[PDB]
Amino acid sequence: DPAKDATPYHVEFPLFRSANMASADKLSTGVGFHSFRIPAVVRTTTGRILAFAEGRRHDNRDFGDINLVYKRTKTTSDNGATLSDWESLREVVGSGDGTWGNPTPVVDNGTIYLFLSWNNGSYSQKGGDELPDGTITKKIDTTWYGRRHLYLTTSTDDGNTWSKPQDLTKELTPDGWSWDAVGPGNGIKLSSGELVVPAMGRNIVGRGTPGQRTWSVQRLNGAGAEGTVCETPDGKLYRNDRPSKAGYRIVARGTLSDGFSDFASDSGLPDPACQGSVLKYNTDAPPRTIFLNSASSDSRRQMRVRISYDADAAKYDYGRKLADAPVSGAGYEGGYSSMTKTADYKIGALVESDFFNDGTGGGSYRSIIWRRFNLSWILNGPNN
Numbered sequence: 001d002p003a004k005d006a007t008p009y010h011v012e013f014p015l016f017r018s019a020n021m022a023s024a025d026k027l028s029t030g031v032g033f034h035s036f037r038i039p040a041v042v043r044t045t046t047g048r049i050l051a052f053a054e055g056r057r058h059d060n061r062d063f064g065d066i067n068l069v070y071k072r073t074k075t076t077s078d079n080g081a082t083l084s085d086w087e088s089l090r091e092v093v094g095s096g097d098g099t100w101g102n103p104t105p106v107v108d109n110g111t112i113y114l115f116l117s118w119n120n121g122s123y124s125q126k127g128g129d130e131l132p133d134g135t136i137t138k139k140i141d142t143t144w145y146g147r148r149h150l151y152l153t154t155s156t157d158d159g160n161t162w163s164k165p166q167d168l169t170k171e172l173t174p175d176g177w178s179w180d181a182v183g184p185g186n187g188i189k190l191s192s193g194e195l196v197v198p199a200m201g202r203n204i205v206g207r208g209t210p211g212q213r214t215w216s217v218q219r220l221n222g223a224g225a226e227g228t229v230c231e232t233p234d235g236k237l238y239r240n241d242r243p244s245k246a247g248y249r250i251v252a253r254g255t256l257s258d259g260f261s262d263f264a265s266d267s268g269l270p271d272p273a274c275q276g277s278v279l280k281y282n283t284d285a286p287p288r289t290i291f292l293n294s295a296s297s298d299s300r301r302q303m304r305v306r307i308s309y310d311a312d313a314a315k316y317d318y319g320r321k322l323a324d325a326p327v328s329g330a331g332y333e334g335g336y337s338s339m340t341k342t343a344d345y346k347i348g349a350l351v352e353s354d355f356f357n358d359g360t361g362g363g364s365y366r367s368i369i370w371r372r373f374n375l376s377w378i379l380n381g382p383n384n
């Protein structure tokens with residue numbers, strides 16, 4: 001791997017700063033956020049980087065009033081290299097007191113398609129949760145009002161503005177579902193031109209051409225709720241999903257035309273039942289798939305980025321622990337993540353972090369860290 005010959009490079013700093021932090025991120029309106037969770041990042045075809053998150057208004061919980069927030073790099077060629085290269089916090093959508101979340105962007109020329117999940121503010125996944133005003137949530141159910149919805153918003157100006165989100169639940173989520181999720185993290189564009197967005201139990205597939213996409217569902221037997229997808233060097237698709245119980249990632253492989261294998265636990269990728277991220281880094285010699293998750297069956301604090309050279313991404317290297325380049329003052333790093341390839345040939349990653357001030361409770365402030373590193377930083381890691 002010639003990338004090992006470069007001097008290792010890494011930078012890391014908090015990008016979404018929770019309410020307890022000195023430069024806590026707020027919207028221009030004055031609306032702030034207790035916590036930021038559920039990152040997604042894409043480099044656009046201009047080289048600008050768009051970073052999305054759930055702005056969790058009042059506490060760190062998955063329900064209640066949650067707005068879909070974002071930042072862009074100030075220019076198209078700074079690659080987010082320093083804190084000063086990032087714009088102030090903006091909002092894609094925050095309408096109502098429900099939950100706008102699960103950012104799952106895909107770039108198509110140019111157009112950025114951002115798929116989102118939504119639920120009414122009176123509902124939560126489990127039900128029975130107490131909101132700040134004292135009302136108790138109902139459990140997400142199969143009704144139009146009480147189910148999880150699937151929305152699409154689009155930007156055609158490099159993330160500067162976003163269309164009114166379009167509810168595509170009846171089109172792209174099976175009838176009779178209650179819970180749902182898209183991503184979170186990112187969708188992909190195949191070498192053959194289709195868009196593929198990972199979702200619970202399915203891929204959302206955009207056929208057609210740029211400027212004229214048509215969406216449908218590919219149902220996947222045994223897939224996770226929170227999936228990742230990429231194209232492997234053999235030209236097939238690869239789903240690498242969060243398992244229903246802690247242990248290992250679950251993986252399936254397939255094509256749009258012929259469908260997917262069963263999902264099976266990947267004993268080489270321990271996972272604590274948490275979201276992960278995957279990235280097709282490059283397509284010529286040597287082709288590389290990058291994977292990032294917490295490499296542990298019981299903790300989110302063992303973040304590990306890895307490379308596979310396999311045509312089917314069967315096996316990964318040890319890779320490198322993100323704790324080798326730790327951040328101070330932004331909490332205990334580990335959780336959900338998202339990766340993109342920057343225009344200056346770095347892996348750009350967003351990673352959740354938890355101040356843990358309230359332990360596992362709802363008052364623990366959650367931030368999101370931005371990292372850039374080159375392949376050399378991974379490859380020259382001590383146990384790699």
Ligand SMILES: O=C(O)C1=C[C@H](O)[C@@H](O)[C@H]([C@H](O)[C@H](O)CO)O1
Pocket residue numbers: 038062125181225226273274
């Ligand atoms: O931090 C989490 O574990 C988490 C955060 C998300 O906001 C939830 O939508 C998601 C969901 O609860 C699980 O995928 C089980 O469906 O889990």
Ligand SMILES: [Ca+2]
Pocket residue numbers: 065066067094095096097098
């Ligand atoms: Ca709101």
